[PDB]
């Protein structure tokens, strides 16, 4: 029971870490797509000037 309790506490640690990694993944992908579309808007604004 102590051994299985150890393994499942380590599984909880891994699941928390995986949730943190996938939310930071999605945050960084959002930052990248915002920068690309801001670059597109900047080119179009220069063409307007």
């Amino acid at each position: 029971l102590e051994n299985a309790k150890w393994g499942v506490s380590q599984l909880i640690q891994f699941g928390n870490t995986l949730l943190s990694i996938t939310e930071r993944q999605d945050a960084e992908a959002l930052a990248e797509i915002l920068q690309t579309q801001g670059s597109e808007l900047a080119l179009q604004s220069i063409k307007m000037q």
Partner: protein, 48 residues
């Protein structure tokens, strides 16, 4: 003309377009670590 001004108008060519700026995330590779030399302990399997 009588004043010296032209009848056929001058050319106004198209200027250079604004370019699109480009960058790149170039990548490298460090290999995996070579696995070390194993050392036999003195304790049994649960302790170590």
């Amino acid at each position: 003309t009588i004043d010296g001004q032209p009848l056929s108008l001058s050319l106004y060519a198209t200027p250079a377009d604004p370019s699109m700026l480009l960058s790149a995330a170039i990548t490298a590779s460090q290999g995996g670590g070579d696995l070390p030399h194993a050392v036999m302990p003195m304790y049994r399997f649960p302790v170590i």
